[PDB]
Design a protein around this ligand. Structure first.
Ligand SMILES: *CCC(=O)N1CC[C@H](C(=O)N(C)[C@H](C(=O)N[C@H]2Cc3cc(O)cc(c3)-c3ccc4c(c3)c(c(-c3ccccc3CCOC)n4CC)CC(C)(C)COC(=O)[C@@H]3CCCN(N3)C2=O)C(C)C)C1
Ligand SMILES: Nc1nc2c(ncn2[C@@H]2O[C@H](COP(=O)(O)OP(=O)(O)NP(=O)(O)O)[C@@H](O)[C@H]2O)c(=O)[nH]1
Ligand SMILES: [Mg+2]
Lengths: 164, 170
């Protein structure tokens, strides 16, 4: 009964492929619901159109700033920030979906997909989902990154929503 | 002949490390905040009649990655300790940076300059006497800068080079 959402990824507007996620509403309900609703756009704002602005090979693909469009913004469905729900789930390997933040209790909309185990983030970033299908698309995205996260072409969420 | 120096810019997130570097390298300033992971720059300058290549390492203001931090401090020959005159915590952070640099380098005497940035802003929370007194207690220079007006920018980097040169005489 955990929800599934899809991203259709684009490179300078051209379709790259689809990534789907299982959202762990069974263990992290409020954080999963934020990401779900941002993916559907049902609140009148969300991820559709926004970019993966920071992609560091061997670590993660980070996106979700639909308010400032530069890596510094984002907002949740509960307000600008919300607290860290729990740390039950850990950064166990590639495909983990976790919240970005600027310190404790600053979750908004930005998120990252791990491309490796990132265990030093355990207890500091809330894990709330995992890649279901399309890890090969995530690996393609990772190739557009660089040492300092700058991407060689514009990587966007051209479409997104809830699967079912 | 010429010389070459590895300068490292450290300090809390948001204080203006990148803006200061981009003014020195590219002679412009933008309001938009682009948070740093890590960036490097080379620039040839003439300081006190001596031509030098500055290898500038612009670090992120972060406190989670100590092994990368330590290597930055091992390789750097001089360090800009940047705080913002409207960020009291960034000034309270400064002593931590000097402590870590001295530890990694295993030395009491490491080329450093204290940089009080955003001096253009009307929202000061750190008075300059505080910063002057701290730099004096360290025996290092204190330079007031604004990346936005370019005030003090060349001064900060050139002074750091002079401190490196003074250290090499010992
Ligand atoms: C004082 C900090 C602060 O308040 N702010 C506010 C504005 C910034 C901010 O937090 N956001 C924009 C925030 C966000 O994106 N959060 C990130 C965490 C983060 C932010 C920033 O600005 C920089 C860094 C992390 C960072 C800096 C330097 C790093 C770094 C991360 C990593 C490494 C590294 C370690 C070991 C080997 C290699 C490297 C990198 C170079 O070689 C490839 N360095 C260099 C010392 C760590 C990796 C994993 C490589 C990158 O991690 C990230 O980017 C993390 C991953 C988890 C998710 N997040 N980014 C965040 O949540 C917005 C508002 C969400 C600063
Ligand atoms: N008014 C004013 N704003 C400044 C000055 N220096 C930097 N800023 C502004 O402060 C913000 C952060 O600057 P930035 O140089 O990116 O800071 P940083 O220390 O490199 N941050 P990080 O540690 O994340 O890399 C930007 O919006 C920038 O325009 C200054 O001298 N005056
Ligand atoms: Mg910077």
């Amino acid at each position: 009964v955990n929800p599934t959402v899809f991203f259709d990824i684009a490179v300078d507007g051209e379709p790259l492929g689809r990534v789907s996620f299982e959202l762990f509403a069974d263990k992290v309900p409020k954080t999963a619901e934020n990401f779900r609703a941002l993916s559907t756009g049902e609140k009148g704002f969300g991820y559709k159109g926004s970019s993966f602005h920071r992609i560091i090979p061997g670590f993660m693909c980070q996106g979700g700033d639909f308010t400032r469009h530069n890596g510094t913004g984002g907002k949740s469905i509960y307000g600008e920030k919300f607290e860290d729900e729990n740390f039950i789930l850990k950064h166990t390997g590639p495909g983990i979906l976790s919240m970005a933040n600027a310190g404790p209790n600053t979750n908004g909309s930005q998120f990252f997909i791990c491309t490796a185990k990132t265990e030093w983030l355990d207890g500091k970033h809330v894990v709330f989902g995992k890649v279901k299908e399309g890890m090969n698309i995530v690996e393609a995205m990772e190739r557009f990154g660089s040492r300092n996260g700058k991407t060689s072409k514009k990587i966007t969420i051209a479409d997104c929503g809830q699967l079912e | 002949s010429m010389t070459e120096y590895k300068l490292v810019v450290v300090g809390a997130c948001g204080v203006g490390k990148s803006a200061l570097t981009i003014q020195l390298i590219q002679n412009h300033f933008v309001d938009e905040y682009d948070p740093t992971i890590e960036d490097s720059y080379r620039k040839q300058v003439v300081i006190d009649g001596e031509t030098s290549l500055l290898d500038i390492l612009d670090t992120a203001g972060q406190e989670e990655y100590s092994a990368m931090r330590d290597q930055y401090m091992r390789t750097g020959e001089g360090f800009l300790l940047v705080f913002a005159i409207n960020n009291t915590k960034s000034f309270e952070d400064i002593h931590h940076y000097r402590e870590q640099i001295k530890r990694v380098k295993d030395s009491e005497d490491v080329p450093m300059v204290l940089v009080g940035n955003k001096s253009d802003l009307p929202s000061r929370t750190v008075d300059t006497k505080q910063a002057q007194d701290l730099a004096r207690s360290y025996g290092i220079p204190f330079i007031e800068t604004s990346a936005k007006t370019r005030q003090g920018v060349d001064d900060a980097f050139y002074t750091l080079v002079r401190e490196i040169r003074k250290h090499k005489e010992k």
